[PDB]
């Protein structure tokens, strides 16, 4: 399933949510339908944490997540950090990042094995990503889009990239990430695919205005069947 969901009318689910294999994060100011989608589809096996990052309802663009670790900005308060430490399982590691770009979901596009980052990140932050997430890192842009997290949706099975992407960039990124990539649109043609939707190994959640060919492209590239 690519599950049709709105955040109070918003068809961008990746902005307000962060979904990994092991956990899920949702914003505190959410509707009953928005919570019920993650509660029904994810089930009781996977914890869902209602969280606020840096005083903001936006959490997907603020944080970058992995099954092994979670990265939070510097502006995240101690109460939010302690609540995430209690609510999250003991396996994941939560570490604050002290870096100027500070919006880790926009900066970092990552999965379990390999990650794409903004080219201009600091070397200490790159080593921190490689340490906490245990993930090999490449500094690359998707056809000149420096915000790889906003302009790519990535999982273990496959990836969706920006629609206006050069084909040569598509095989280059596909060989670099060792996963097949498809250029496509989400939410009735919105270009920002990573902000448009969240995905993991068995679930994808998207906006209600995402059309049927777009949803078919999603389930084909992410192998959710």
């Amino acid at each position: 399933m690519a599950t049709r969901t709105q955040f109070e009318n918003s068809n961008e689910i990746g902005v307000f949510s962060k979904l990994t294999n092991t956990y899920c994060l949702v914003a505190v100011g959410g509707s009953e339908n928005f919570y019920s989608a993650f509660e029904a589809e994810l089930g009781d096996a996977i914890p869902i944490v209602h969280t606020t990052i840096a005083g903001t309802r936006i959490i997907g663009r603020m944080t970058a997540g992995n099954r092994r670790g979670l990265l939070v900005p510097t502006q995240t308060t101690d109460q939010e950090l302690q609540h995430l430490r209690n609510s999250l399982p003991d396996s994941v590691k939560i570490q604050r990042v002290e870096e100027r770009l500070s919006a880790l979901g926009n900066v970092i596009c990552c999965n379990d094995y390999v990650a794409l980052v903004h080219p201009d990140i600091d070397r200490e932050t790159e080593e921190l990503i490689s340490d906490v997430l245990g993930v090999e890192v490449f500094r690359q842009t998707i056809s000149g889009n420096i915000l790889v997290g906003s302009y790519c949706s990535l999982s273990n099975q496959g990836g969706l990239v920006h629609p206006q992407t050069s084909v040569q960039d598509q095989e280059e990124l596909s060989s670099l990430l060792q996963v097949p990539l498809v250029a496509g649109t989400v939410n009735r043609g919105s270009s920002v695919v990573g902000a448009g939707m969240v995905v993991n190994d068995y679930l994808a959640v998207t906006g209600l205005d995402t059309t049927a060919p777009e949803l078919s492209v999603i389930e084909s590239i992410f192998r959710l069947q």
Binding site: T77, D78, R100, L101, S102
Partner: protein
């Protein structure tokens, strides 16, 4: 609460005190008062202003 440090003088900043300034290169500065804020805007070096923590650390005064 959190007690922040003055970006110019190193003084302790209590909640609701002073000002904050986000520069165009996305760097955050925090000023405890208008005196240190105005010295920052006048582009003085805190290594040469005699009452700052960075000056006293440089000059080994009370260290």
């Amino acid at each position: 609460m959190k007690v922040e440090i003055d970006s110019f003088s190193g003084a302790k900043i209590y909640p609701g005190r002073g000002t904050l300034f986000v520069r165009g290169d996305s760097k955050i500065f925090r000023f405890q008062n208008s005196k240190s804020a105005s010295l920052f805007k006048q582009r003085k070096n805190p290594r040469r202003i005699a009452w700052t923590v960075l000056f006293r650390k440089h000059h080994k005064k009370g260290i």
